[PDB]
Every structure is written in structure tokens, then in C-alpha cells.
Amino acid sequence: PFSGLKFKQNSFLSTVPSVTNMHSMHFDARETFLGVIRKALEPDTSTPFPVRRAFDGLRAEILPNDTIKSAALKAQCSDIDKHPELKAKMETLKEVITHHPQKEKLAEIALQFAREAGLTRLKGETDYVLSNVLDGLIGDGSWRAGPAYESYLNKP
């Protein structure tokens, strides 16, 4: 679908919040994490213009900057069964994510978000967009089983 699409490597690192802020009582794990993925998916300038404009429309629709648009997309994906076009777009974007040259690092960031900020606290009930993005980074889908936690009490 998007041949010749290239990304500037390490462009998304500056967008990852500090672990201390991930523990904030009003931290928005979904929006902040999707911001990292949006930044990581920003096409490199070396990509041909037709592909850039084509892909920029895909990620702009699926990973919008505006909170109003992001929330509207979230609600519209709750009944994704009635929105095949989003199904195709989300499927297309997930295909791009799984081929991202730095998918391993993005997977580590996603796991850090789940570990610290509770990104995947809903487990299997995660919204369609966030679940698809994670499935792209984590192919097996094991993240649906939330992070393992220490449970200090009753320790041997």
C-alpha cells in the first residue's frame, strides 16, 4: 500500500514522557502514547511526495492531533462493525506499524506505558484504535494479559 515510505529514526524518542510523569494521577496514557506513535510514524522527508500525502492522510485520520477529533474517532470505533472504511484504514495502518524499522523500540515504549501508566489496564476491552496499534507493535497480542506486578505482601 505504501511503498517507499521511510521514517526518520529516533524522531519519537523526544516525545516519550518521563516515567515519573507516567505515574501522574491525571496522566492520559492513551493520548500520550498515541502521540509517540504518531510522531514515530511521521514520514521522512526523503519519502516521495505522493506517498507522503497519501500516508499523512491515513495517520491524520487514525492518529489526529486534536483531542476532539481523537475522541470522535474513539467513539466511532466503538461500533467499528458499521464502519468498514475505518476497518480498512486501521488494518492498513497496522500493516505499516508492524513493518516500522524501529518496531522493537516502539514495543519497549508501549510496554513501559502499560507497566507505568496503565495503558492496557482495560486488557481485552481496549478500544479498537489502541488495540490495533499495540497488535502492530506486539504481534502475538500477549499485552491483553496486563503487566505482571510484584505483589509485595506475603512474600517468602
Add this chain to the structure above:
Amino acid sequence: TALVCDNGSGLVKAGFAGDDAPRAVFPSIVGRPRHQGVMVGMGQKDSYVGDEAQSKRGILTLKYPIEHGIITNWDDMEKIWHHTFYNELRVAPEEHPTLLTEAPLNPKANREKMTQIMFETFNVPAMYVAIQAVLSLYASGRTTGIVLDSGDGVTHNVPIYEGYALPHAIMRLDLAGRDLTDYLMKILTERGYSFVTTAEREIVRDIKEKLCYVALDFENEMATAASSSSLEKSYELPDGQVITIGNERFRCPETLFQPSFIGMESAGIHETTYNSIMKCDIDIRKDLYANNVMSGGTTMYPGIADRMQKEITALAPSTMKIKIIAPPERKYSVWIGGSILASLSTFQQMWITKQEYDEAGPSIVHRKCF
């Protein structure tokens, strides 16, 4: 009315065409919290823009969306522009054509994207991208002269004669205020002062702006500083601690004339200006020698004009008259020129209209704008 937004690397100078000074001047930074929690109703706002980020600087991680005159974080740049239009100017961008600036020899995708955002995200009726050096000449009122524009990200000089630019003679150095700021915090460690955070980098920038100056003769100034304490100045940090700096006052600006201080192989701004003039036609060099116009914050160091006068005079033939024009409104020369250009009746046909963008796309900027 037309909006003039001089989105520099360090500061955003925005206002309305026809005014004498920008209405809004705030830092071009987006700060996001880096600490934890912990109070209900006190952390809903993620990211702060401009002066608010500077005020809450202590708990944020500040980041400039523009580096070396190139927009590197377009999501943050969108936040900066949204802050400018709606929060600082209190205008609807869809009702005003917007003139904005950029440095010469920038990546073309930089102009293309900013054209794309202005038309598709803000629905501006029309827009224009001007060269900052050219606007400075508009502000000075001349039609001939070699401008030396040095802001936070990039320093460049554009030789213009009788209104004609010599694009083969443009110069660009990625050595500007921010590079000087970084050097100052590096040489401040020699006195035991450690500034490492982005919040503290702003304090070092304030120290630079308040205390740094250009020595007329560097070697003599170094000897004077070594031999006596007359050049030492004290500065009070936000928490009450007092720091004193001696030769660091003029060593930091000296990097402009000696880029090797920060490991750069390039030549000083004095020699780059002379090289730019030497690349121009021999018949116009005399006029350029007499119309070196400074603009940008990085040219606000005390004694910079006298140093540039001395350095170029030693390079140019002795029979030329070297004149440095450094207006007190140097720091806003670019915005003033943009305001002049935007309000010119003969300029109203040079806008990129929304209709033109629709037919041609973001590539229209390369045809309509220098």
C-alpha cells in the same frame, strides 16, 4: 488585515500588518510536565506553550519545535501557531492573510509543510513565506545592502543590490544564539556552575542576554580579565544564589567570530560577511561595504557593531568605507519589514491564495515565494 508571524527559532513575533511593533512576543517553546501527580484537578493540562511554559519552567521539560531555523516537531509547531492566533492575537486565522518568514537555504519540505498547515489546519485565506534577511532591508528602508540576520537558530547574510538578491552569494551558518547559550553553560562549569536541565538552559540564556558582550580586541580583553577583576559581574539565580562571571562574559559572544570555540570549522560572521561580499559582482561591492545591516537578537550584544566594523575593515581594501547599520529595533527588524511588506498595495498580488493552493498544492510556495 494581514497577520505577520515571524516564527523564529527562539521567539515567536506576531502581530498585524501596518503596526510598528509585534503585538505578541513569547518564547517558541512547548513544555510538558516531567514530575508526578499528585493533586486532583492540577494536572489535566498536558503541554504548555510560550510564556506559560516559561513560568512553569521548573516542573516542565522545555522543547523548541524549531531548531536551526528548521521546524523539527510539527505537532508542537501547530500548538505554537494555535497559541499565537487564538490566545495571543485573539483572531480567526480564516479571516486574515498570514505572512510568515524563514531563513534562506532551508529544506523545501519546511516551506511545503508550513504552507500545508496554514491552508488545511487554519484555513487561512492566503499566505506568504518571505526570507528574513530580505524583510530586514524593508525595515531599514534601504533597497541595497548586505543583511546579517542572526537569531536563535541560524545566522545568515543575504546581499541585495538595487532590490536584486544574489542567491549564489547567500551564506548560512548553524551558529546562533542557542549555540552561544550552550557554549556559555559549558564554560560556566569552569567556575563550578552546573546548568544541565532545559529549565536551567533558559536561565543561562538570561545570563547571556544580560551580561555577555563582544570585546573589541579579544586577546587584550582576556589579558585584562586575567590581570584584574574589573570585568566580573554578578547575577542572581531564581533561587537567590549569586553567580559571578569574568571572561565568560565576552568569551561566549566570541564564538560568533571564532566558531572553532565550539568545534565548528566555519569562519566567523565577520569573515562570512566579507566572503559573501567577495562573491558579489565587483561593481556592487562598494555599496555593500557601506550597507551592512544587522538584525536579530544575536546581534544585540554590546560592541558587536564595533567589532564587525573593525573586523571587516581589516579584510576589505583600505580605500573602502565599511559601515555597520545596527538599528535599536534590530531584534524586531524582520517583523517590522514583514509588516511593511504585507501592507504594501503592490504586494497584494503576491499572496498565495487558497484557490491557488487547491489547484497546485503545497508546491505552489516554491513558485510564488523567494
Add this chain to the structure above:
Amino acid sequence: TALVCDNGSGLVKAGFAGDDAPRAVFPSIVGRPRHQGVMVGMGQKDSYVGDEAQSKRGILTLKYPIEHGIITNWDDMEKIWHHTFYNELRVAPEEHPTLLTEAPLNPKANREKMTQIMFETFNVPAMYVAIQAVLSLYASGRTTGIVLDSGDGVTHNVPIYEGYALPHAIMRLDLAGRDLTDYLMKILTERGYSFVTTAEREIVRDIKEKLCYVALDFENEMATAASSSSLEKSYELPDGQVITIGNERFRCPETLFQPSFIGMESAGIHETTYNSIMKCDIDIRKDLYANNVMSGGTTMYPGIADRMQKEITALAPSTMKIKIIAPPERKYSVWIGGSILASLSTFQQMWITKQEYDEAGPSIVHRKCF
């Protein structure tokens, strides 16, 4: 023969040039009694130094004269040097040139006062102050490479190519073993082990040296610790009590790669190394990538070399060959390099002589030393 004294924030490594290992390696601490004695003939010594202070730490307040590579208590540093020369090496300092070491980007007054004490208090015939990262390369035997030196107080990167250092690319990070020790104290309170006082900071330093390690994948290690309990290990305190430590084993060293968890805004050592390389000339980066030399005690964590290799490989372009050099003697590599340098025939003209000192004062150190 010349003396090589690697002062260091945590340990004093002292010996003679030409030997393969330092003669004396003792803590850089000075202990003052806290309690009342209280017998006749006991406790007439007002202070204890090095191993003696460590042995008697139960009734002593231990204090490090050097903090973050900077000497903060010069009277105590004089005690340590007096102990090193007279009680550990058993030499008359007036006969032997002394090679000293310090981190880059230190305050100038630190090395100025080092010279003054050596020439006046100890009357050494000559001395020299070397940069620790440079010496580590001497020990490795290479002429090119970027050294990551991480001791107790300072972690700094120095890229060197063909014997030429790129000082503008030198990165310094005030996060080292002592900061990791303090963090281990903090997270050990999550369990019932509340050292939480300055008495037992050395016991948890020993715990850190014995049990802590760097996880190749932090998330996988955290999951394994949460699930299995197979990573739990037990440590016996001097009291005979046994503390069990689980994921704190690899969480404490994780602060090196995530300077957060201690509230630092800087990037991890992997990114600092990469940033240092990217500040260098593009033509030497390939050689730097293949010559990542690690030195200092803080690099002795099991798996840190593997972690550094993985992390830098993720930052650098895929075609580059990343290679971490981690000698088994990297804890003493700095002293070994000092020994090699001090014994070179070509180095015998680089000493700062007593005649040169009193002719020029402590400022001579800046001219003759990097």
C-alpha cells in the same frame, strides 16, 4: 619513578608508574567519631582515613572529600593524600613526580588547587593532571575510540580519534555509582530494609556491588521478577540479619539508562554516548561506533556491556558496527593508563616542574594539562 594517583570520587588508586596494578586501593573517606569514647587511652585520633575508617565505620561519620569528581573538603583531601603517600605507598613525595587525574569539565579551581597542594604541602618535584577518559584509552592501548568512564561521582564521554580529542563532543553526566547507591537505599525501603540513614550507606554499596546487575530487557526482567521470584537473592548484613532483594537488583542499575527514577532530566548513558558520537565529525563516527571503551567501577555491572551494545545499536544506523570494549580490568583502566603515560619517554617533558610552578603559579596547570 613517578607516582600515579587516581583520586576518584569513591576509591583512591595509587601506585608507581610502570606497575600493572595500583599498590593501594582504599576508600576515599574520612571518618570522625560520633559517640563519647569513653575509655582512657582510646579514641585519641580525631579522624580515620580509608580502610581504617571503613573498619571503624560503626562509630564514625563517614564523609567523602570528593563529590561528583569535585573536591569539596580540601582539608580532608589533604588527609587522604597524606595517607596515600606516607601510609600506603610509604614514599617521600619530594622525590617522585606525581600524576593526578580528574574528570573533564571540572571547575578550573579544582585542578588549580590540586597543583598548589602538591607543590607546596607535599613539595613534589613535578606533577601532571590527566583526564581520566584519556588514560583509559592508554590502558586499552588504542588511539581511537569513545571512552565511557563511570566511577563513583561522574560519568563522562570523551571521543578520541587518532589521538585527537574533540572537546566540544565531551559529555559529562553527574550520575554515577554514588547516585545509584542512594537510589538503592531509597527503593530498599519498599521492603522493610530501612537503612534510610547515613550510617549504613556503605553496606548498601556492598549490596549493590554484590547483587545488582543490568537487565538486557528491563520489561522482561520486571515481568519475570513479578511472576517467578527466581531472581530473588539474599544478602547477610554485618548484624547477621538477612535481606532478600528481588527486582531492586536490576532497577538500581537501570537508572543509568533511564536517569529518571531519581528525577534527572538527562538521557541515559547509551543516548549520551550516541549523542557524543553524533556531535563528532561524520567521518570518524564509524570508528567511534566500533571502539566504545568502558571504564570505571560503575561499568562493572554484569550485563551492562550487553545492554550498551543493544541500546546503541538501536540508535545508530543498522549498517554501523557497534562494539563495546569492556576489559576485565576496566575498574583500574584509568590507573593503568596513567601508569603507561607516566612511564613514556616522550612524556618526560610534559611534567609541570616545581620551577615552572613558582614561576607561574597554579595557573600553569591550565597551559600544560588538557
Add this chain to the structure above:
Amino acid sequence: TALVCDNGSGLVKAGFAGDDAPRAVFPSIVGRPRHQGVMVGMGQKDSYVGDEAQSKRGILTLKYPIEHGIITNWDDMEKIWHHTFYNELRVAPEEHPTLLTEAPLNPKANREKMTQIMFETFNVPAMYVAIQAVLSLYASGRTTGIVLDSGDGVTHNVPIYEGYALPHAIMRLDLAGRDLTDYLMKILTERGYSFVTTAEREIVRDIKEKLCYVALDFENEMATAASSSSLEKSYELPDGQVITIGNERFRCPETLFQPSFIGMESAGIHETTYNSIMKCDIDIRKDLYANNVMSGGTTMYPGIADRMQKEITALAPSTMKIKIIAPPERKYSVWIGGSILASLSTFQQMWITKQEYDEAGPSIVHRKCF
């Protein structure tokens, strides 16, 4: 035997007369370290020449002693020649007549200094200074034809008929590979790639050498590039970074045919060759049209011969047969011709001998040579 040293602006081609290819080919650069210190005992030198300068290019400042065919730094040129004779050819210049080459219409002091240094410094028994365009004809084996020699410094045309040059018809443009390298550096910034150092100029030179080509129809190629990415090629920098280059591949060599790209008020090489032929006698133009011979590295661009055939054919009358002779070894054609000339028995009485020089002085070169 005789030495043939074709030291152009960019490369030094040296060897023995009678050989089919130069023995030593290396860049005409002197590099000097621009960084500090720091390791004693290392095999460091105060300057590096030729291939060694390229190897250690990362930590050096590279200077070309020759620019636009004129030697501007004679001290550097001396060590370039010393490097050629002693370290590359491994000969004693005292016992070898040495043939040198230079471009037409050069300053006479250039030839005089070249002669003076060879006889006084290198004490050669005899020497001769030939014109590069003439030598190319020797290599081609002809005695008639108009030679277009384009190296790193200068492009010149020399029409020759039956061995007779028409010096009033000789053309010389100071536009050659180095100007193309600088232009490629400038237009690469359009894509965000920034090369500013002398070391990085060599990288851009390599990109130009192995990616640029001449477009048969410039406007058609521009449309093709704008419409598709088929013309885009990737190049891996020394640090593993990959740069993608599109229409810049042919826009750089297009400067040869449109000097206005770099602000030069001059005719392209096609028009200069045509203008030269028209300055010749009408009776020889037909043979000149059919014997356009290319030489020099700057003529190695793919498709340049076809472009020149197309361009001149559009200028010359339709009945003339335009033939561009572009041998595969036209990069070394000048040296090959010099080797042929120096090995001719009929040429042996045309050397400037040491006895001749000491009697007449450096000015002898103006009488004995072209």
C-alpha cells in the same frame, strides 16, 4: 627516464614517461589537524598530504593548494610535490627530467614559480611546462581538433589544426568540478542534507562522482523527476546515514551548460566550444566540428558527450558533422599525452635544462614553453 606530473586543481597524476597510466594518483590536498591533543607517543604529524589526508579527513582541515588552475599556496604545493617524488614515485628528482602541465591563460608568475621551485628546491636536471589541452591531443593521437579539458579547477577550449594552435581562439572558464561540488552542496540543503566542513565537501564530491549525470533534455528530466521517483538514488554516508537524491543528480552537472545556476554571467561549455570554433578560420571549422575531444574528470558525467553533441549540433549549421570524441580514459588523457610527449626523441632538445635556467632565470619558461 622522465617524470610526468599532471598536478591539476583536484588530483595529482604522476608517473614515468612512456608508461600507459600514471603510477601515483592521489588528491591534491594538504590536511592539518583542527582538534586538540591529546595522546603522547602517537604517530602524529603537523600536516598530511594526499591519500593520508583523505583517510584522516575526519579530524583535519583540508586545503587545496591549487584553485582554478592557479597555485595559491606555494608552501603546500611544495610538500605536495615532495610527497609525489619521494613518497609516491620513490625517485630522486635530481636525475629525472620532469614534465609539468598547466591550463592556458594562467598567470605567468605561476609558470615562473613552478620553474623556480623545480630547479632550486628539487634540483631537477631539466623540466618543461606543457598545456593540458595540447597533451590531450597527443593522447588521442590526433594533430587536429578542439579540446575541451575540464578538471577540478578550470574548463578551457584549445582549437588545434595540423598541430597549429589558434591562441586568440583559446577559451577558459573558471567553472569546473569544484564549482559543481559546491553547487551540489548548496542544492542538497533543499532536502535537509547539510555539508559545511571541508571533510564533508569530499563526501559531496563522491556523491557527485558516482550519482550525477547530464540530462539530454533538462526540462524533460525535470518534469520526469517531478512526476515520479524513478530518477531518485540513495547514497550511504560514512556514518551509515542514507541520503536520497533526485533531480539534484542532473541539476548539478547542468551548471556546465547553464552557468547562471551559480550566478556566473557566462556561456555554457557547449557555447564556449562553439564560440571558440567560430573564432577560428572558416576553412578549419569543418575539421574542428568533427574532432571535439573531451578530457578531464569533469567530462566523465554519463550523457555529457551526447548532450554536447546535441547542443553544438543545434548551434552549428545543419550540414556540419559534429563528433564528440570522449575516450574512456579521458580522465587520464592529459597525463597520457604528457607521457607520450616526454618519450618522443624529437622532444628531448626542448627541455629547459639547468644550464639554461641559471643563465636566463625563471623567465626562460616563457620562451621555451608555450
